């Protein structure tokens, strides 16, 4: 499966991809899973996590 | 819904969350969508993208 960018995006970190509207992108298989923005109830810290590292309670 | 961390994770960028195995985490609503590792066919560059910025071809 190929995706098309709907908008321009500028990278904020060393790991995200900059792209322009119209680019064709393919999903890369990755053991970490998709990444989600999460809040730790335990510590109060907040940021992105790799989905394959967690499980529902 | 709450998730539990299955492993320790150390942050690599300014935006990911470090956590220890056993922490309780909640998903933050986010306009960007989940993030996926992608390869640009157009440019050859590779990195994470916000899913809500793309659509299937």
Author numbering:
A (entry chain A), B (entry chain B): 84 to 140
Sentences from the paper on this structure:
Cellular Src kinase (c-Src) is one of the most representative members of the Src-family kinases (SFKs), a group of non­receptor tyrosine kinases that mediate responses to extracellular stimuli, phosphorylating a broad range of downstream substrates. A number of these mutations are located in the SH3 domain, which plays a critical role in enzyme function by facilitating the interaction with partner proteins and providing the formation of the closed inactive conformation of the kinase. Here, the crystal structures of three SH3-domain mutants of v-Src were determined to unveil the effects of these oncogenic mutations in this regulatory domain.
The crystals of v-Src SH3 W95R-I96T (c-Src SH3 D117N-L124V) belonged to space group P65, with unit-cell parameters similar to those obtained for crystals of the c-Src SH3-domain intertwined dimers. Comparison of this dimer with those previously reported did not show significant differences. Both mutations, Asp117Asn and Leu124Val, do not produce significant changes in the backbone of the protein. As in the previous structures, a low-molecular-weight PEG is positioned in the dimer interface, where a cluster of interactions stabilize the domain-swapped form of the protein. We obtained an intertwined structure of the v-Src SH3 W95R-I96T variant, which shows the same overall fold as previous domain-swapped dimers of c-Src SH3, and the mutated residues do not produce significant changes in the structure. In these conformations, the Leu124 side chain adopts different conformers, facilitating the rearrangement of hydrogen bonds. The replacement of leucine by valine, which has a shorter chain, might impair the ability of this residue to act as a switch between conformations. The v-Src SH3 W95R-I96T mutant is the most stable compared with the proteins bearing the oncogenic mutations in the RT loop. Asn117 forms hydrogen bonds to Ser134 in the 310-helix which are not dependent on the pH, and might confer higher stability on this mutant in the acidic region. Our results show that a v-Src SH3 variant bearing mutations in the n-Src and distal loops, the v-Src SH3 W95R-I96T variant, shows reduced stability compared with the c-Src SH3 domain but is still able to form intertwined dimers.
